[PDB]
């Protein structure tokens, strides 16, 4: 659906970018079909935008060749952008693409970072200049351009393949072109504090409310006079808080005054918004403010104060609660002392809060996302707290077992299985786990139990493998009906996901032994045998025992008539 | 041409059993040589008596290719047979004249004509 | 009276079917092309349309057969050889495609798709300089292409 | 064994006297539904004029009914039937006789089952007897495109006539599109539409037509619940159904928003076969009442008894039904090609000595 002109232009650019070095005259031609300046006022059509994009991809993939000629063209174009004639809005997407390729170029080479950053703040300063200084052009093409350049301020990729390259494949991206406020997802760019302080000043200036009322009023006046946007306040609000979180998400070693100031600003905004909202898009902004507050915590005292605040909040919007859980996990992993305070609240929430029951929730016959998120938070919590207190996990699974003896048992079983699988690097903790699973039989929960123990078997330990084979062999020799399809599915999964070859051959020969033991609905194991054996090269020589088992199996198969 | 055609014949005889890609090349080479223009002064082939060897040798090679059961479909065979018939008829559109070649080089022409006659007679499908 | 009204009717039906081909409705296209083929069963353009509908359906064999049959009638058709070269290149045989492309460019040297396909085939080899030159030729030729060929207007005193 | 008399004598030979209007309707015009039910279960047919009279009077009754029926609880709600007449009979056995049980059917009387005309005749007779207590909704197959693509048209032409088929189709064109149940539930065959936010958007439709290729009524008849339930990270209420080629899937937030804005509890629908006869997703419940779908699915059927603000699922198994060759094909069409093939082969062998 790309067309013909676009596809061949992209093919030409990509073929150019692989020829290193590439002759300068070809790039000069490429700039020749690129637009040129007319008295400082530019024009734009689809083909010129395509040419600009293709030149950008060529420069990106060209291993940073001949930047001295193209980069000045690009910065002149971005300088002339605010008054570019125009023939989801196209302008915001074009600005998104150009800011993206500029950001990738800035990350690739450090010598120009100051220049690119400074022209960036200059152009947003100019935009701030005339936004609050006609209404049709400003509404149609100025603020949408602001949103487009806002969507990708500082986000960048650290991959072997450039970022825009993934945006335009060679044969998910369309999602980025269909939403309203989507975005993208360690050399620590040396942005001087003055630029960051200026950016914070702009953020504080734009979050004003009176300007939002004025722009909404003028938009309504334009709409009634004779566009795709309806109300700019909420999308804007969301956009500036989002990129304020994202740009400062991963900075370290900053002066404490700036941290204190931003913490005060974010807490003020959060409490004001929370007070106002007790009367939709503001929930994501509240989550962003919460994340900023978690990042803005440096002392233990504030850490447990925040933990208490969230703990009161939990036992009273869904993404807000998810981000609250994520922030609680972040605090618990960053500070080990608060573990003893955070584990009881989360454990009680899992084993009891009514919100989980309502989410699960007459229904008479005659949920998992928050569940496993909390379970992963528990795993992170105990793997962070095991550095200080080695006996905390013992009391922890003692409490879980106590809850087990005293629906909810399914949650307990799943949690215990997750702890057992996640903590393979621990001392002999899995032996008590298998002990309690074996002793906790009696029962429809046997299916969940057998699936959990199969997941544990996937780990691949010899002793647990021997015990589980004893149990499964006894179960098979016994023939309940409900625990036969379960066992065959379990061992099929095991054979599908065993890695170490020693146990592979051992289980293969032992399966053959079981099959020959079945020699007095019988050949139901042969799909599992085929699934296992499709993972090895042909057998030439082996133990004569295995040859005897194969001979017996073949003679039994032909005598039952399974060969024909 | 008299020896080039012999080289082509032997190579085609080998390639008929050996491979299955040179067959298309041979078919394209044969198809683009003859034409269905039996008429006054346009046949894409000389009409002198002294050049009846290569003509009928090529026609016999085409017939042999047609009789080997190699071409899959049933619309190329119609075109090939029509072109062969057209060229064979086109040869006979001039007043008869007597041969001018030497005593040798004349026996083999008669032998080739007899071979083509036999191959044409055998064709019945 | 003369035979040219039947040509006009067949061209009408083919033009009608071409719109259906451009939107993705194989059944109506098949009905229209069968109706057109009721008059002339051996026309090459009707075989081209049959190959088009077979390719849209999703078969890589019937389209090849139809294209070969069409090329066996009029060996100077460019669209048929272009499509055959495309499907052959996507199949894997990289030998015959170059020869067909060279024959096509020898016959006519104003169709940009020929240059584009030639460059795409050459890219899989490694001599990408000639591929870039072919791409340059293709887009400079396409820069001035008309809706229909200019030779439609009769050349008569 | 006799070469003229029938071998399997326990099957009684159907009467060749097509029943007249006086034989099926009593002095007051009420259908004798026990007689009619026995005859149709015996694969008996009606005279063309009586079937046409029943269908057009029923269409006229629907025509005089409102777009949105105000049916009160208690009710037994039934999903797709798809021509499984003997399973419709089992459904009525399990749910209770219409003489003392209120019923709502969600469509798909035709399409895939080979007793579609018996289903139509029996449901129309019940509609005659209980015009304000038994209701029949439209499914997406109750249109010309699918009934002409599948076998219903051929069935009509074999057993009745093409004109009887067209009259039946116009009656299906008369079928109401939706129900407002206990002021709590929107009941439709398929589901929701981006263009339906209130019951009045349904009430305002013009239903007396062939279903269009697009729009809210189409979506009502054609839409499905999504593949993943409870983990819908996506934010779009309705997304393009790439399997069907038209209309949309609707999401759980969409349903919850519609229910809250309209003060509704849930939505009752059909359209997708279920191994148990039902699925509970509560914002949504699908009910499916066609057991052993296509004679191969081996599924159970269920009905939903809605009473006293309780949704009581009642399951039942499939029942035997008489056999038909595909597409109601006759023995001449089936066997004559093979006869001609084998006789030609023999002649070829006789000559190729």
Q: Do the beta carbons of residue A459 and residue A421 sit within 8 Å? A: yes
Nearest to B6 by CA among B54, B67, B65: B54
> D141 an active-site residue?
yes
Beta-carbon separation of D309 and A361 below 8 A = no
Q: Do the beta carbons of residue A242 and residue A179 sit within 8 Å? A: no
Angle among Cα D262, D264, D266 to the nearest 5 degrees reads 135
Of C129, C135, C142, the CB nearest to A11: C135
- Of D17, D39, D141, D261, catalytic: D141
Bridge partners (DSSP) of residue D187 are: D179, D268
Q: Do chains A and D touch (3 or more CB pairs under 8 A)?
A: yes
Nearest to D51 by CA among D42, D59, D63: D59
Q: Do the beta carbons of residue D186 and residue D180 sit within 8 Å? A: yes
Of A5, A8, A18, the CB nearest to C128: A18
Task: Judge whether C145 is closer than 8 Å to chain A, CB to CB.
Answer: no
Q: Do the beta carbons of residue C71 and residue C77 sit within 8 Å? A: yes
- Is the backbone of residue A469 left (phi > 0), alpha (psi -120 to 50) or beta? alpha
Residue A188 per-residue DSSP state: -
For chain D positions 152-211, those within 8 Å of chain A (CB to CB) are none
* Structural tokens at position D97: 């006789």
B30 Cα to chain C: minimum distance (Å): 13
* Structural tokens at position C56: 């849209």
- Interface probe with C: pick from B28, B35, B75, B80, most Cβ of C within 10 Å: B75
Nearest to A495 by CA among A521, A534, A537: A534
Residues 6+ apart with CB under 8 A from A124: A149, A202
Cα dihedral A251→A254→A256→A259 (10° resolution): -30
Residue D303 per-residue DSSP state: E
Instruction: Tell me the technique behind this structure.
Output: cryo-EM
D261 is in an annotated binding site: no
Residue D15 per-residue DSSP state: P
Residues 6+ apart with CB under 8 A from A392: A339, A340, A382, A385, A386
Quick count: other Cβ atoms within 10 Å of Cβ A545? 11
Q: Do the beta carbons of residue D289 and residue D277 sit within 8 Å? A: yes
Helix (H) and strand (E) counts for chain D?
Answer: 12, 13
Beta-carbon separation of A367 and D309 below 8 A = no
CA–CA gap between residue A416 and residue A480 (Å, rounded): 26
D212 Cα to chain A: minimum distance (Å): 28
Nearest to C52 by CA among C85, C24, C10, C12: C24
Q: Judging by beta carbons within 10 Å of its beta carbon (0-12, 13-18, 19+), is residue A492 exposed, middle or buried?
A: middle
Q: Do the beta carbons of residue D195 and residue D223 sit within 8 Å? A: no
Phi, psi of D214 (to 5 degrees): -160, 165
Task: Judge whether B75 is closer than 8 Å to chain C, CB to CB.
Answer: yes
Residues 6+ apart with CB under 8 A from A447: A482, A483, A486
Beta-carbon separation of C69 and B73 below 8 A = yes
Task: Judge whether C116 is closer than 8 Å to chain A, CB to CB.
Answer: yes
* Structural tokens at position D32: 């004798």
Q: How many Å separate Cα A522 from the centre of its chain?
A: 46
Answer positive or negative: Cα dihedral of A255, A260, A265, A266: positive
D17 is in an annotated binding site: no
Residue D211 per-residue DSSP state: P
Q: Do the beta carbons of residue C67 and residue C80 sit within 8 Å? A: yes
D271 is in an annotated binding site: yes
For chain B, what percentages of helix, strand and coil (3-state, to nearest 5) are there?
A: 60, 0, 40
Beta-carbon separation of A8 and C136 below 8 A = no
CA–CA gap between residue B109 and residue B101 (Å, rounded): 11
Spell out which residues of chain C touch residue A21, defining contact as CB-CB under 8 Å.
none
Q: Which residues of D174-204 are buried (b: 16+ CB within 10 A; e: fewer)?
A: bbbbbbbbbebbbbbbbbbbbebeebeebee
Q: Do the beta carbons of residue A334 and residue D280 sit within 8 Å? A: no
D140 is in an annotated binding site: yes
Which chains touch A (3+ CB pairs under 8 A)?
A: C, D
Q: Which residues of A178-208 are buried (b: 16+ CB within 10 A; e: fewer)?
A: eeebebbeeeeeeeeeeebeebbebbeebbe
Phi, psi of D62 (to 5 degrees): -60, -40
D304 Cα to chain A: minimum distance (Å): 10
A364 Cα to chain D: minimum distance (Å): 6
Q: How many Å separate Cα D46 from the centre of its chain?
A: 20
Task: Judge whether C132 is closer than 8 Å to chain A, CB to CB.
Answer: yes
Residue A239 CA neighbour count, 13 Å, CB half: 21
Whole-Å CA distances, A327 to A359, A470, B7, B97: 21, 45, 85, 108
A439 Cα to chain D: minimum distance (Å): 34
* Structural tokens at position A290: 């919460």
* Structural tokens at position B29: 């080479």
Residue D212 per-residue DSSP state: P
CA–CA gap between residue A465 and residue A510 (Å, rounded): 12
C69 Cα to chain B: minimum distance (Å): 7
Nearest to D220 by CA among D241, D202, D239: D202
Nearest to A318 by CA among D232, B79, D111: D232
A-D CB pairs within 8 A amount to 22
A5: closest chain C residue by CA: C139
Nearest to D77 by CA among D277, D227, D224: D277
Which chains touch D (3+ CB pairs under 8 A)?
A: A
Phi, psi of D68 (to 5 degrees): -120, 105
Q: Do the beta carbons of residue D139 and residue D175 sit within 8 Å? A: no
Nearest to A145 by CA among A168, A160, A128: A128
Pairing of strands D75-78, D301-307: antiparallel
D49 Cα to chain A: minimum distance (Å): 45
CA–CA gap between residue A506 and residue A308 (Å, rounded): 53
D189 is in an annotated binding site: yes
A14: closest chain C residue by CA: C132
A367: closest chain D residue by CA: D230
Whole-Å CA distances, B72 to C67, D5, D147: 15, 55, 42
Spell out which residues of chain B touch residue C68, defining contact as CB-CB under 8 Å.
73
Beta-carbon separation of A12 and C129 below 8 A = no
* Structural tokens at position A20: 């290193």
CA–CA gap between residue D59 and residue D170 (Å, rounded): 8
Residue D321 per-residue DSSP state: -
Task: Judge whether C129 is closer than 8 Å to chain A, CB to CB.
Answer: yes
Of D230, D235, D280, the CB nearest to A363: D280
Q: Do the beta carbons of residue C84 and residue C67 sit within 8 Å? A: yes
A-C CB pairs within 8 A amount to 30
* Structural tokens at position A45: 């059509």
Beta-carbon separation of A366 and D314 below 8 A = yes
Q: Do the beta carbons of residue D268 and residue D281 sit within 8 Å? A: no
D111 is in an annotated binding site: no
B75: closest chain C residue by CA: C69
CA–CA gap between residue A30 and residue C135 (Å, rounded): 13
- Is the backbone of residue A123 left (phi > 0), alpha (psi -120 to 50) or beta? alpha
A182: closest chain D residue by CA: D235
Spell out which residues of chain A touch residue C139, defining contact as CB-CB under 8 Å.
5, 8-9, 12
Spell out which residues of chain D touch residue A179, defining contact as CB-CB under 8 Å.
235
Spell out which residues of chain C touch residue A29, defining contact as CB-CB under 8 Å.
136
Task: Judge whether D313 is closer than 8 Å to chain A, CB to CB.
Answer: yes
CA–CA gap between residue C72 and residue B75 (Å, rounded): 8
Three-class SS state of D285: strand
Pairing of strands D134-136, D103-105: parallel
C135: closest chain A residue by CA: A12
CA–CA gap between residue D94 and residue D122 (Å, rounded): 17
Q: Do the beta carbons of residue D289 and residue D85 sit within 8 Å? A: no
Beta-carbon separation of C119 and A16 below 8 A = no
Of C65, C68, C72, the CB nearest to B79: C72
CA–CA gap between residue D79 and residue A336 (Å, rounded): 57
Q: Judging by beta carbons within 10 Å of its beta carbon (0-12, 13-18, 19+), is residue A340 exposed, middle or buried?
A: exposed
Spell out which residues of chain B touch residue C69, defining contact as CB-CB under 8 Å.
73, 75
How far apart, in Å, do the first and last CA atoms of chain A sit? 53
CA–CA gap between residue A92 and residue D3 (Å, rounded): 85
């Amino acid at each position: 659906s790309r067309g013909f002109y676009f596809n061949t232009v992209l093919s030409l650019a990509r073929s150019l970018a692989v020829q290193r070095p590439a002759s300068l005259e070809k790039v000069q031609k490429l700039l020749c079909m690129c637009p040129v300046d007319f008295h400082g006022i530019f024009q734009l059509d689809e083909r010129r935008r395509d040419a600009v994009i293709a030149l950008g991809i060529f420069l990106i993939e060209s291993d940073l060749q001949h930047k001295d000629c193209v980069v000045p063209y690009l910065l002149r174009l971005l300088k002339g952008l605010p008054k570019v004639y125009w023939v989801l809005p196209v302008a915001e997407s074009f600005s998104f693409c150009l800011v993206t390729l500029l950001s990738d170029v800035a990350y690739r080479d450090p010598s120009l970072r100051d220049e690119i950053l400074e022209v960036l703040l200059q152009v947003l300063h100019v935009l701030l200049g005339m936004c609050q200084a006609d209404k049709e052009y400003l509404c149609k093409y100025a603020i949408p351009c602001l949103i487009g350049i806002s969507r990708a301020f500082g986000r960048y990729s650290n991959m072997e393949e450039s970022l825009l390259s993934k945006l335009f494949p060679k044969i998910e991206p369309e999602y980025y072109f269909s939403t309203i406020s989507s975005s993208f997802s360690y050399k620590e760019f040396n942005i001087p504090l003055e630029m960051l302080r200026e950016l914070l000043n702009l953020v504080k200036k734009i979050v004003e409310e009176a300007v939002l009322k004025s722009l909404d009023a003028i938009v309504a006046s334009v709409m009634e006079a004779n566009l795709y946007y309806t109300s700019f306040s909420d999308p804007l609000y969301l956009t500036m808080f989002k990129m304020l979180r994202d740009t400062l998400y991963y900075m370290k070693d900053l002066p404490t005054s700036f941290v204190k100031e931003i913490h005060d600003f974010v807490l003020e905004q959060f409490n004001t918004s929370q007070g106002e909202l007790q009367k939709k898009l503001r929930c994501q902004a509240n989550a962003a403010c919460v994340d900023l507050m978690v990042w803005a915590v440096k002392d233990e005292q504030g850490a447990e104060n925040l933990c208490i605040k969230l703990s009161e909040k939990l036992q009273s919007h869904l993404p807000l609660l998810i981000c609250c859980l994520q922030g609680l996990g972040r605090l618990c992993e960053r500070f080990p002392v608060v573990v003893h305070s955070v584990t009881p609240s989360l454990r009680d929430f899992l084993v009891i809060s009514p919100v989980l029951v309502k989410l699960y929730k007459k229904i008479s016959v005659t949920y998992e996302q928050l569940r496993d998120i909390a379970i992963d938070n528990i795993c992170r919590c105990l793997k962070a707290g095991l550095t200080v207190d080695p006996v905390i996990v013992e009391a922890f699974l003692a409490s879980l077992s106590n809850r087990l003896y005293i629906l909810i048992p399914d949650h307990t079983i799943r949690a215990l299985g997750h702890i057992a699988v996640a903590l393979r690097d621990t001392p002999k903790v899995m032996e008590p786990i298998l002990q309690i699973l074996q002793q906790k039989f009696c029962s429809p929960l046997d299916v969940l139990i057998i699936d959990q123990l199969g997941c544990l078997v996937i780990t691949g330990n010899q002793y647990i493998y021997q015990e589980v084979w004893n149990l499964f062999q006894q179960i098979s020799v016994k023939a309940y009906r409900h625990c036969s399809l379960a066992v065959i599915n379990a061992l099929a999964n095991i054979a599908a996901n065993i890695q170490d070859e020693h146990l592979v051959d051992e289980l293969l020969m032992n399966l053959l032994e079981l099959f020959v033991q079945l020699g007095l609905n019988l050949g139901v194991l042969i799909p599992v045998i085929a699934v296992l054996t499709r993972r090895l090269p042909p057998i030439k020589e082996a133990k004569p025992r295995l040859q005897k088992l194969f001979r017996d199996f073949w003679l039994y198969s032909v005598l039952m008539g399974f060969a024909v | 041409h008299y020896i080039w055609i012999d080289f082509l014949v032997q190579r085609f005889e080998i390639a008929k059993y050996c491979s299955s890609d040179q067959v298309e090349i041979f078919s394209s080479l044969l198809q683009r040589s003859m034409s269905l223009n039996i008429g006054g002064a346009k046949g894409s082939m000389n009409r002198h008596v002294a050049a009846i060897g290569p003509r009928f040798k090529l026609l016999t090679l085409g017939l042999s290719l047609l009789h080997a059961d190699v071409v899959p479909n049933a619309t190329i065979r119609n075109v090939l047979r029509e072109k062969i018939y057209s060229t064979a008829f086109d040869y006979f559109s001039c007043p008869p004249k007597f041969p001018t070649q030497g005593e040798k080089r004349l026996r083999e022409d008669i032998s080739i004509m007899i071979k083509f006659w036999t191959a044409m007679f055998s064709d019945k499908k | 009276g003369p035979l040219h009204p039947w040509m006009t009717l067949a061209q009408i039906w083919l033009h009608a079917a071409e719109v259906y081909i451009g939107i993705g409705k194989p059944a109506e296209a098949t009905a229209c092309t069968q109706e057109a083929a009721n008059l002339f069963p051996m026309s090459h353009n009707v075989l081209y349309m049959r190959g088009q509908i077979a390719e849209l359906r999703g078969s890589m064999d019937e389209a090849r057969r139809w294209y070969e049959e069409a090329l066996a009638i009029s060996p100077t058709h460019v669209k048929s050889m272009q499509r055959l070269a495309l499907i052959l290149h996507q199949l894997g045989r990289y030998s015959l495609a170059e020869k067909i492309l060279r024959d096509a460019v020898q016959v006519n040297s104003t169709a940009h798709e020929v240059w584009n396909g030639l460059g795409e085939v050459l890219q899989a080899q490694g001599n990408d300089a000639a591929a870039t030159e072919c791409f340059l030729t293709a887009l400079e030729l396409e820069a001035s292409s008309p809706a229909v060929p200019f030779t439609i207007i009769p050349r008569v005193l | 064994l006799s070469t003229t008399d029938r071998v399997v004598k326990a099957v009684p030979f159907p009467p060749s006297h097509r029943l007249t209007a006086k034989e099926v309707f009593d002095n007051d015009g009420k259908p004798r539904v026990d007689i009619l039910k026995a005859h149709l279960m015996k694969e008996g047919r009606l005279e063309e004029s009586v079937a046409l009279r029943i269908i057009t009077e029923g269409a006229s009754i629907l025509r005089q009914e409102k777009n949105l029926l105000d049916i009160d609880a208690p009710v037994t709600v039934c999903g797709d039937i798809h021509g499984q007449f003997f399973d419709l009979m089992k459904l009525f056995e399990v749910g209770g006789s219409p003489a003392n049980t209120r019923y709502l059917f969600l469509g798909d009387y035709v399409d895939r089952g080979y007793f579609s005309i018996e289903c139509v005749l029996y449901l129309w007779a019940l509609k005659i007897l209980y015009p304000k207590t038994l209701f029949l909704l439209r499914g997406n197959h109750e249109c010309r495109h699918l009934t002409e693509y599948f076998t219903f048209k051929q069935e009509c032409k074999i057993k009745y006539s093409e004109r009887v088929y067209d009259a039946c189709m116009d009656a299906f064109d008369c079928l109401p599109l939706a129900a407002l149940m206990n002021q709590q539930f929107l009941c439709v065959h398929g589901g929701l539409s981006p263009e339906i936010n209130t019951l009045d958007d349904i009430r305002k439709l013009d239903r007396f037509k062939e279903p269009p290729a697009y729009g809210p009524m189409c979506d009502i008849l054609w839409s499905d619940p999504p593949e993943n339930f409870g983990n819908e990270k996506t934010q779009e209420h309705f997304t393009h159904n790439t399997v069907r080629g038209c209309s949309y899937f609707y999401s759980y937030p969409a349903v919850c928003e519609f229910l809250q804005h309209n003060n509704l509890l849930s939505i009752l629908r059909a359209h997708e076969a279920q191994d148990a006869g039902y699925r509970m997703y509560p914002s949504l419940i699908t009910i499916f009442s066609a057991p052993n779908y296509l004679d191969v699915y081996n599924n159970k059927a269920a009905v939903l008894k809605y009473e006293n603000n309780v949704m009581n699922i009642r399951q039942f198994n499939c029942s035997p039904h008489p056999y038909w060759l595909p597409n109601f094909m006759d023995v001449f069409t089936w066997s004559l090609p093979f006869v001609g093939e084998k006789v030609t082969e023999m002649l070829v062998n006789v000559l190729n000595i």
